[PDB]
Amino acid sequence: DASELQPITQKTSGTELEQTILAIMEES
């Protein structure tokens, strides 16, 4: 299904922004 835009994970994280935001939310 490519119906909607799924939430990002560490596999589909591209940039330093998404890496740092996912690191903070993983430490949460």
Added chain:
Amino acid sequence: ALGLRTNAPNADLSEILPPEIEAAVKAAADISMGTEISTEDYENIKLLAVQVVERSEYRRQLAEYLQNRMKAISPNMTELIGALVGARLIAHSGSLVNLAKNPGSTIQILGAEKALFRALKTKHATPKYGIIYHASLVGQASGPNKGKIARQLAAKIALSVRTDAFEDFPENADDETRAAVGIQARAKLENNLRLLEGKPLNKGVALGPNGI
């Protein structure tokens, strides 16, 4: 005013030409494909632009001087056709008293002399006008009325040049009474032009749908 293409979003250009013309210059400065030049060559390009703008300012003040000197010399002819065409006629004839010795048929075809003498020697049809074509009063007509107004205007120019080159004045004479023949001839000639333009078209039989 606009420097290199890098100075285009920070330029001011509305003082020389209004927008709807000079927003496309900023768009094309963003999207163009010219090669980059140093500022050390833009000094030469800006300085040649300085040169040609200064030449234009000098040519404009030379045109104003030519207008003032023509209204000083020949007020009748300047009231008839204007200073630039009057100066062209004075230039081709050599001087004012050398233009004044010319008939109106000569003043009609001053400047068109190559076509004139070609046609006269080969039995072709001569040109209708010369320098007179770029006056104001022959440019409003259209069709054969252009040649008719060229004839009439050349005759009035001959009268006005003879008046401006031979008539004396008490030296406390206003310019409005020094250009009296020019004012009267221009008013009469504009009336004749609007009659020639308001000549109506030919009547016809108005037919119905049947042909009756």
Added chain:
Amino acid sequence: PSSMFFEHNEALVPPYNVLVDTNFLSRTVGAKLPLLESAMDCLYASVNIIITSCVMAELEKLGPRYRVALMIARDERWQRLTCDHKGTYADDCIVDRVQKHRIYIVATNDRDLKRRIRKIPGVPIMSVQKGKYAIERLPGA
């Protein structure tokens, strides 16, 4: 065409390109005669030996009596010139090919096609003459 000096084709130098017709192919299988070996023994030179799809088409259109000549033609080591035309008529295909390019040696045995290709300057005609082959209008052989 270039390389033509007054009905002398200078374009044909070995390895010789030889176009094969169905009559020549049926008779060189009928005379117990190997095709490339006898062409090389006739010309004393290396041939490359080509068969148009019209020639393969007429050999297939003839029945299963000619299956041996069909397999002999369908030997893999030979060039197959695909044709881009409609009728699959081998005579007009060969004549149009030869009229365009004129590098070929036409190997036939029917006198109609032989008289048709004798009119144009500078193509040799190879025909089997019951003992071996025989080349007609090639000057170097």
Added chain:
Amino acid sequence: AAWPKAEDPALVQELLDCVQQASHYRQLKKGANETTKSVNRGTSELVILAADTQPLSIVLHIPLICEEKNVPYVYVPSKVALGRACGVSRAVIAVSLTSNEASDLNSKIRALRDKVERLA
């Protein structure tokens, strides 16, 4: 700067042997201006350029006309060897050897320009 440079293993000496053969056959133009005029007149089949030239811009200007006319060009590494191979008693930095309709040198020319087109 000279990217179609000839390498050592018996290609430079094949080039210079073909150069000497053409110089005996009088089918060869010597020097930069004569190579340039032969390429621009289109009679050239191959052009050899020295690579040991004091400043290299001469045998850099010749490949532009050779690439525009599409003739093969190749650099040999010694102008002294090129002059000795031509038989000049001067060092030659550019050699263009032309085409004729009937020779036996043209087989060497054809094999040499096949090797040069493989070198490019």
Added chain:
Amino acid sequence: GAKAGKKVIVEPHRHKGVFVARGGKEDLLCTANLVPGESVYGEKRISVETPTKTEYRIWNPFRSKLAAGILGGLETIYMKPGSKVLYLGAASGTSVSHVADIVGPTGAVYAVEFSHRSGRDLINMATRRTNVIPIVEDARKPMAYRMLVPMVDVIFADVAQPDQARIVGINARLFLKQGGGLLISIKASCIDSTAPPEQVFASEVQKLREDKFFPKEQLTLEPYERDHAMVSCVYLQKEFEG
């Protein structure tokens, strides 16, 4: 010869965009100059003052294989004014200027050169002419300029390579319309130096036909160049446009 200052008259050719200027003792071929008042490579050009901005430029057949083919008498050259032309083998941009002058301002010429100094000369003449774009890339790898070349109508191919038919085959598979015109200039001494030239030309025509072209004309452009041919062919159809 055709000295400077002689008066010639300029009539249209049978082709579109090409003119023939005849006068006195020498009739020559010319194309309408896109940027007037300046020559590219120091050619003779023809000025006519119409009853200024109109100038024609003379097309040397000994220098350009397209003008050699036009004077040989091709049936068509496929490049009408306003047709996109992909030029392969645009060495220094001498004949590319005449192709751009044929296709005019509303056409486009995508000139592919591989070498770099020829690329400099090409970028200079394409700075002058705004309808030729220069592409410095290898013509053997057309994946490099697939962002730059849209589907063109004509391909000119003046590459002297032994893999010339494969180069033109992949370039026309990528950037040529259905029923696409092309002119390929075959040099027999560079294709196969041992074989006779007529056999080389027939083999190259057969390779094009295997690479899906339909060849329609072929002339050996003989009084201008030895052992050269120009083959005209249409991609994926029998008629040119449709």
Added chain:
Amino acid sequence: VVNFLLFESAVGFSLFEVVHQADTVGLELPEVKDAMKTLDKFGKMVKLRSFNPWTSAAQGLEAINLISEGIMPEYLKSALEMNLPQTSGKKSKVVLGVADKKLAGEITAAFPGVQCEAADTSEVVAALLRGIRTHANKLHKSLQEGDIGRAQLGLGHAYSRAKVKFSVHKNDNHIIQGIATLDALDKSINQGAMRVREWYGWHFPELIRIVSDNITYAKVVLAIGNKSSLTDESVDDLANVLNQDQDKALAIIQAAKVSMGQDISEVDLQMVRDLASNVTSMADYRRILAESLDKKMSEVAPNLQVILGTPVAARLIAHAGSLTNLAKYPASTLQILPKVKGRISRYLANKCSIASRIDNFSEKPTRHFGEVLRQQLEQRLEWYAKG
């Protein structure tokens, strides 16, 4: 069986989603070729799914210089992350169609669930991307801002110039057009000075007999005012115009005292001094051009500058058309552009051809080879005197 396909163009890259995919056995059939021709029967096949334009020409230049080399860019990875359904290829894959095989391998290595089909290998996706390249102007026109022609033109120029490094060693246009300006305004300076000389010698006819160097004539008719208001060494001017105290200003003033020409009016004197200001402004611009053109010639072609001299050297450059044409010409063509005079002419043409090719084909050229050849011409000038 294709699911999506990438398509990169000069305005940006767009990926289409195929519905009713193409028949692969009848690809060489005339009805299917006519379907690929007509837009009304190929737009049923492709439906535009996503579009990503560039932000700037710098990003488009980086896009070509990554894609042509093979490596995919980060924003292409971004748009593929956004448009493709996120999978890994264990139980369901997505078939993407791309034009290049190296890009196919990299997209498959970046996304393991996306199987890429290259147009260089697969005839179905080759014909399908060929149809999209055919109809690419109409498939995008609802969001195609402007056109594609000028974008492809400017982007091909930017790509070729970045590959060649064109602007760092193409410099001759300033020189050739500066020669054109220098000759044109030298003629205009002489003509305006002749005009002001006649039209001021009508008023004061002693100045033409007593003063030459028409630029200094324009300066003295700028500073002199009228015939009546002369004094010799008033302020700041005549001491550095010419000799001051005992040589010139006295002679101009006694020429004014014995002068007999027509008396001029104020407005006519205003117009003559305006013309003189014009002429001397053009003369100042001529000396600025000469200094800047000498510096530009020493930057571009110093060897020709030292063996010929910069005016005649840049005349030769402008008449040849460019430095590349000047270097491509041989020495006899450079002769085109007694006996000892022709011999020195041929020798000078040879060494000027060598200097032109040396100064052209360098990246940033030098000085000493032109110095050596000028010393060689000087020692030949010494050599011909012994005979």
Added chain:
Amino acid sequence: ELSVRVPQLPGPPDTLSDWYNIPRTNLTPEL
């Protein structure tokens, strides 16, 4: 913004559109 139009209603071609507008021959006796 939006003006009244000028109504401008009152054989072989003069200039060739495909050949960049070569004018038709003014057949003078010298030509």
Added chain:
Amino acid sequence: AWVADKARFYLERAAPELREWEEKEIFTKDEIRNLVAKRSDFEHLVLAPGTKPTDFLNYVNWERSLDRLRAKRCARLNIRSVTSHASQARTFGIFERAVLKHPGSIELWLAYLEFAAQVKATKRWRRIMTRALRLHPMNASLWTLAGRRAAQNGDMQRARAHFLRGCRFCTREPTLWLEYARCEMDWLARMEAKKPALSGAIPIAVFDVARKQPFWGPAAAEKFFDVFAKFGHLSCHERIISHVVTTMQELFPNHPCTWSVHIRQPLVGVDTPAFPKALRESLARLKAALQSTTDRKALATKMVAWMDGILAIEKLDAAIRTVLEHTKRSL
């Protein structure tokens, strides 16, 4: 153009709703002939070759006003049997072939999203939003609409998904970055008002990644501070503001924007005796800023703009007001 045969289907689909409206007493027969003629003219205009998004929007507005008119008339005539579902289905059909024909028109995409949000279609709205974002990825307005509506729904993970893909794409302008910091701090305020998150480190991380972007100017960092300075009633707000000020001071030391944040820093959550105390602190900072070596015209224009923002509020003292006027006039 097969437009007659193409529009025949849409008219034959809209026919049985008209049969139900005629068999009820809701529309009379002449009015139903008028509805037939108007829908026929609209369909033959919509399915024409040369069409426009304003034409599609005129048809959408007419069908939606017909649904509203029939709703008013049905409530007046007291019928409950007639439903609006067929009208909503055909309006969705108009919009779907609209976004098929003209996908590059954000006015029509936003009108589609407004219609789908207005008749309570959340899942359909999310699918339309995904298609619109795929076609216009550089549109900060579409990205903020997606992220703000997902935050308004409360799916903060989906709001972060839309916002992080948006900040991955839109990096030319600061707008979507400012809106993402605004949405993250609004989530922080929601997490506070519900009483990691205790640190609130995500806008500091947004700032630290935004430090290397192609829009990174001192004016852009001042826009970051002007976003952050709102809703100061939080926990780590002083931490965020102080980090912004020390970042701007360590990077752009003598910029008028950095002097402006040095002026306007200590007035975070003030409205009240702590108001003029921090005002006197800030005015000391401002007087030091005005005398200090900075572009005084730029700093004065910033301060007269902020002082218009100051003068916009009532409930102050007249001596403070007139000394703001006195310090304003000589700038």
Added chain:
RNA sequence: ACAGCGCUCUGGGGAAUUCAGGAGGGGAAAGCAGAUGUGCCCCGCGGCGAGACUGGCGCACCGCCGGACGAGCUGCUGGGG
């Protein structure tokens, strides 16, 4: 002019205008391959998928191929409420 040859014949030209056809160029998103309102929940089937296992092979030894559990998320014009 005679002789000869060709085309054509409600004789032959030109113009205006009406109707019936033919060929070509350019422009057009030029797109009716299966046309079913929205929202939630349950069922069935299917995808991502964190994590946890397990079988056999492995004489370049460095690694393979395969089973079945699964938090969480999600699709359905499959059908029912």
